[PDB]
Amino acid sequence: ATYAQALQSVPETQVSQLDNGLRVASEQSSQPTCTVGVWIDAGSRYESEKNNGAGYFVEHLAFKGTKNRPGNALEKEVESMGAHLNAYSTREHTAYYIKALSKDLPKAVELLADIVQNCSLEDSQIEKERDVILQELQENDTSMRDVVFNYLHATAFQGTPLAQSVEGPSENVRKLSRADLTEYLSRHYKAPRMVLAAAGGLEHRQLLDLAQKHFSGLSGTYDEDAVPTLSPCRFTGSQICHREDGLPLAHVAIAVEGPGWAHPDNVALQVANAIIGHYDCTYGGGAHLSSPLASIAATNKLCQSFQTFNICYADTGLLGAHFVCDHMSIDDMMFVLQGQWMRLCTSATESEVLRGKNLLRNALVSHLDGTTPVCEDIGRSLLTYGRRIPLAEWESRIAEVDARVVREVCSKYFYDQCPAVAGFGPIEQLPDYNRIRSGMF
Amino acid sequence: NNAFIDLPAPSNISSWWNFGSLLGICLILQILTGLFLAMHYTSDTTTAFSSVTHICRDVNYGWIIRYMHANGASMFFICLYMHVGRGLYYGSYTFLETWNIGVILLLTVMATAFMGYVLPWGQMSFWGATVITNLLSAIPYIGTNLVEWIWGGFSVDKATLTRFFAFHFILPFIIMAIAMVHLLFLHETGSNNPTGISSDVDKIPFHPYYTIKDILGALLLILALMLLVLFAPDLLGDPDNYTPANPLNTPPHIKPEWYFLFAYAILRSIPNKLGGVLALAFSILILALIPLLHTSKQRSMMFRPLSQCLFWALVADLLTLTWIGGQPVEHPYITIGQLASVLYFLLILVLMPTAGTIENKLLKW
Numbered sequence: 033a034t035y036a037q038a039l040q041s042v043p044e045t046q047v048s049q050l051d052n053g054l055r056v057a058s059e060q061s062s063q064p065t066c067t068v069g070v071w072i073d074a075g076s077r078y079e080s081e082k083n084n085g086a087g088y089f090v091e092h093l094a095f096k097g098t099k100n101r102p103g104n105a106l107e108k109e110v111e112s113m114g115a116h117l118n119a120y121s122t123r124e125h126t127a128y129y130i131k132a133l134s135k136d137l138p139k140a141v142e143l144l145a146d147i148v149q150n151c152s153l154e155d156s157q158i159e160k161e162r163d164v165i166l167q168e169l170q171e172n173d174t175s176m177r178d179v180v181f182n183y184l185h186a187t188a189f190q191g192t193p194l195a196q197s198v199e200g201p202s203e204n205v206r207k208l209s210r211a212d213l214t215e216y217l218s219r220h221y222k223a224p225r226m227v228l229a230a231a232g233g234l235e236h237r238q239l240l241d242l243a244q245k246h247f248s249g250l251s252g253t254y255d256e257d258a259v260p261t262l263s264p265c266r267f268t269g270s271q272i273c274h275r276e277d278g279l280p281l282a283h284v285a286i287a288v289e290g291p292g293w294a295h296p297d298n299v300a301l302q303v304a305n306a307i308i309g310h311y312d313c314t315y316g317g318g319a320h321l322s323s324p325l326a327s328i329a330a331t332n333k334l335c336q337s338f339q340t341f342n343i344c345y346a347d348t349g350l351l352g353a354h355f356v357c358d359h360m361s362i363d364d365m366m367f368v369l370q371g372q373w374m375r376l377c378t379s380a381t382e383s384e385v386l387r388g389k390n391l392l393r394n395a396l397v398s399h400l401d402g403t404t405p406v407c408e409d410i411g412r413s414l415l416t417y418g419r420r421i422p423l424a425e426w427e428s429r430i431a432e433v434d435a436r437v438v439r440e441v442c443s444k445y446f447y448d449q450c451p452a453v454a455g456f457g458p459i460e461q462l463p464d465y466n467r468i469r470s471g472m473f
Numbered sequence: 474n475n476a477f478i479d480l481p482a483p484s485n486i487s488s489w490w491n492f493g494s495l496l497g498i499c500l501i502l503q504i505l506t507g508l509f510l511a512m513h514y515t516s517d518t519t520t521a522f523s524s525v526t527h528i529c530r531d532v533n534y535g536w537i538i539r540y541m542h543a544n545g546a547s548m549f550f551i552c553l554y555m556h557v558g559r560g561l562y563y564g565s566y567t568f569l570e571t572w573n574i575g576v577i578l579l580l581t582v583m584a585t586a587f588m589g590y591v592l593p594w595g596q597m598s599f600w601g602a603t604v605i606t607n608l609l610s611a612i613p614y615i616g617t618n619l620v621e622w623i624w625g626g627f628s629v630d631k632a633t634l635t636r637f638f639a640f641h642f643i644l645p646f647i648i649m650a651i652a653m654v655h656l657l658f659l660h661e662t663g664s665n666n667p668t669g670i671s672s673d674v675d676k677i678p679f680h681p682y683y684t685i686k687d688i689l690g691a692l693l694l695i696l697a698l699m700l701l702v703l704f705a706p707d708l709l710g711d712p713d714n715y716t717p718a719n720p721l722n723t724p725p726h727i728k729p730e731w732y733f734l735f736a737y738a739i740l741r742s743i744p745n746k747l748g749g750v751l752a753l754a755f756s757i758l759i760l761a762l763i764p765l766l767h768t769s770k771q772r773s774m775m776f777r778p779l780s781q782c783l784f785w786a787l788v789a790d791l792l793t794l795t796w797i798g799g800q801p802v803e804h805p806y807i808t809i810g811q812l813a814s815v816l817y818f819l820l821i822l823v824l825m826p827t828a829g830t831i832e833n834k835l836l837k838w
């Protein structure tokens with residue numbers, strides 16, 4: 033078949049909803065294994081300065097025992113059936129998911145229901161996790177990449193909830209109480225804020241009945257005065273430079289404000305980012321890479337690596353790049369990078385945009401490879417778009433992009449716009465903000 | 474670029490650091506207006522003065538080019554004195570090479586301006602040429618021979634004016650080259666700053682920060698120059714030079730261009746020929762000694778109150794000397810001028826170095 037007919041053969045994702053508001057979505061395949069999980073509209077963007085880190089603390093407690101399965105009982109059950117239980121928290125979403133044999137879907141759904149509704153939160157466990165989290169904060173401090181990205185959010189979204197890290201400040205970790213957590217939970221873990229998603233060898237009808245059976249008790253009301261809604265987050269052209277000449281390589285992240293999840297412009301932006309691409313010293317292409325930034329960097333040894341990114345949030349986002357380089361290569365790297373954004377705004381060619389479109393097509397499909405990536409796409413999509421966008425639609429959106437669309441969309445977000453800049457390490461050579469700003473036009 | 478764009482500069486230099494660029498601008502202004510004046514000027518003693526009046530009366534915009542050149546010379550010195558003052562106060566002279574070239578630049582500009590003043594051949598022109606060249610007659614055994622050699626005769630005459638036009642024409646270009654060396658030496662160290670403390674931990678790009686400050690400064694300099702040219706073109710000049718040179722008569726109240734008055738007062742304060750000429754020379758060359766007289770453990774005067782008081786006493790004293798240089802050689806001006814002359818050298822050679830040592834002891838080092 034052609035790439036076109038193959039697109040129309042992907043089973044359509046089935047979506048249902050319970051009385052309490054919980055959405056149930058699934059994509060059936062014939063895999064003897066599956067992934068099922070709960071995606072929640074909860075994250076640090078929903079936290080205030082007082083409880084920032086609450087969600088991450090809960091993630092630490094989620095698998096430590098439930099009222100029905102105290103202590104390591106939940107753990108033993110997951111392990112004995114050979115399943116895998118994982119979780120993650122971001123500034124807007126939280127997810128708990130299980131990879132298991134398709135025949136074990138009923139127990140998998142029960143366990144998730146149990147986890148999301150009956151978490152013990154034993155005072156002694158809370159004290160133990162407190163120390164674990166503090167140690168994780170210390171470890172994260174050694175990850176220059178994680179530090180620079182937290183810094184980018186701190187400065188770009190300064191004064192708003194998006195400026196907050198997911199883990200929260202250490203003093204919050206030392207002071208968060210069970211009361212704080214149960215409070216956070218009663219407020220955010222409601223059925224209308226959750227999506228039960230599954231992908232693999234199972235039928236929607238079976239998942240739906242299991243959901244009715246195990247999630248019906250989940251609250252779908254809350255009230256009116258306590259319905260955590262999101263306010264837009266102001267973006268600020270600014271710079272944060274943490275100079276540390278003791279570190280061997282400098283990390284720099286720069287971005288302009290992105291449009292947010294729902295905007296159609298994200299497709300063209302993804303095409304443009306694909307044109308500039310990514311790179312690191314282990315890439316075999318070197319001097320022949322198609323991206324001018326990549327080949328210049330490789331032939332002139334300008335950096336160890338770089339990556340463009342389009343981080344999306346509800347109504348805003350960070351569109352830009354991150355690079356790692358020697359202290360004497362920062363200005364050159366910034367010069368070439370900004371020159372490439374400007375070239376795309378004013379002179380993107382049909383041939384490079386086609387390449388970008390093909391890169392995006394390949395990335396889209398190769399990403400949805402396996403029950404876990406698919407299940408995550410279902411969960412997240414339902415939370416963000418309110419629907420699963422089919423591949424055939426993505427193709428239509430990508431197809432609509434041409435050189436004209438790329439120049440116009442890039443001009444809209446990059447041209448003469450104030451960026452947010454974060455630097456960490458031996459950054460004496462990181463350009464002054466005025467010089468960076470002038471580089472935007 | 475390696476003279477602009479990414480040049481690292483201290484984040485805290487003040488407007489006192491603007492004079493270097495203003496000096497460059499003054500030099501370009503002088504060279505441009507000068508070249509245009511040279512296109513109409515003739516150096517024959519019979520036609521010099523007339524050619525200048527011709528420039529001002531019949532050459533299109535000749536008057537503005539002429540007065541911009543005259544007042545430009547004044548702006549040049551105002552900037553020179555501010556530039557040198559900044560260097561003294563902030564201890565910039567510790568950049569020995571940059572500073573010493575600086576001294577050469579000051580002396581060359583003085584010589585250039587002197588010769589330029591001689592070109593229109595007015596009364597001040599002729600007597601200034603007479604007096605200044607004769608300074609060499611103070612040199613034992615060969616002084617007189619040197620003067621006549623420079624004059625090209627036994628007195629200031631035709632041969633003198635023609636060679637002065639030639640020297641005045643070329644010297645400014647030599648000054649430009651020397652200025653570029655002044656800057657090459659400065660770039661090796663980078664600029665000093667108000668605190669006198671190394672600014673390597675807080676540098677900012679020259680562009681856009683100081684390129685914009687320099688432009689603002691340039692505008693203010695141009696405002697000052699044109700206020701003089703368009704509203705008071707003769708304010709800083711001497712009426713006597715509007716009278717053709719007369720070799721048989723020296724005006725009774727003859728006096729030097731304002732920017733030379735302090736040195737004139739010092740020389741006039743000494744009733745000995747060789748003594749006055751030596752004092753005159755030392756009044757400028759002492760600049761080359763300043764680095765050797767630095768006793769303070771700190772570079773700038775910013776944190777040195779005693780040194781500051783003496784510094785301003787030195788400025789007030791130069792103002793005193795400037796005033797005296799413009800008065801007749803009569804009581805009480807004679808005594809005031811002598812006291813001011815002595816204080817000048819006393820401040821630089823004794824009081825300031827001593828205050829530095831006192832300040833050191835007060836800080837226990």
Ligand code: HEM
Nearest residue numbers: 490492493494496497560565572575576578579652664665
């Ligand atoms: C044709 C005349 C001259 C020109 C064009 C000139 C130009 C400059 C320039 C462009 C700078 C840098 C900007 C600044 O700090 O002002 C500078 C610095 C300096 N100049 Fe000059 N200069 C001249 C004469 C002199 C003289 C007469 C002296 C001293 C006897 C001198 C001493 C210095 C010193 C010591 C510095 C370093 C200042 C600091 O960083 O603190 N200059 N000059």
Ligand code: HEM
Nearest residue numbers: 503504507508510511514543546586589590592593642645
């Ligand atoms: C360091 C730069 C210079 C200085 C400080 C300077 C200064 C002076 C002074 C003081 C005068 C007398 C003005 C008056 O009262 O009439 C003069 C005259 C003159 N200068 Fe210059 N000059 C400079 C550069 C030049 C250059 C580069 C040339 C020619 C290429 C030039 C050509 C003339 C001419 C033709 C006159 C005679 C006309 C007149 O008196 O205005 N000058 N200059």
Ligand SMILES: C/C=C(C)/C=C/C=C/[C@H](OC)[C@@H](C)[C@@H](OC)[C@@H](C)CCc1oc2c(O)c(OC)cc(OC)c2c(=O)c1C
Nearest residue numbers: 580583584587597600601604606728729730733736737740
């Ligand atoms: C061939 C080239 C030659 C010989 C150049 C030599 C230049 C020497 C010096 O510059 C380096 C010199 C200009 C400089 O001395 C440090 C000045 C401050 C001298 C100041 C000066 O001016 C006067 C002046 O202008 C007059 O005008 C009408 C009249 C004057 O008395 C009647 C004087 C005078 O009595 C003095 C001391």
Ligand SMILES: CCCCCCO[C@@H]1O[C@H](CO)[C@@H](O)[C@H](O)[C@H]1O
Nearest residue numbers: 296421422424425426428429430432
């Ligand atoms: C830039 C183009 C925006 C609109 C693209 C819509 O694209 C369409 O979406 C439908 C529903 O998902 C699909 O069934 C259909 O095959 C697809 O072509």
Ligand SMILES: CCCCCCO[C@@H]1O[C@H](CO)[C@@H](O)[C@H](O)[C@H]1O
Nearest residue numbers: 707708709710711712729730731799
């Ligand atoms: C900018 C302020 C400068 C001081 C103004 C006075 O200036 C003085 O005026 C006298 C009479 O007109 C002149 O003879 C003298 O040469 C001149 O320097």
Ligand SMILES: CCCCCCO[C@@H]1O[C@H](CO)[C@@H](O)[C@H](O)[C@H]1O
Nearest residue numbers: 793804805806807808809810812813
């Ligand atoms: C700055 C100090 C001012 C100088 C005061 C000069 O004062 C004068 O000194 C003359 C010296 O022969 C005396 O003959 C004269 O009577 C006296 O008034």
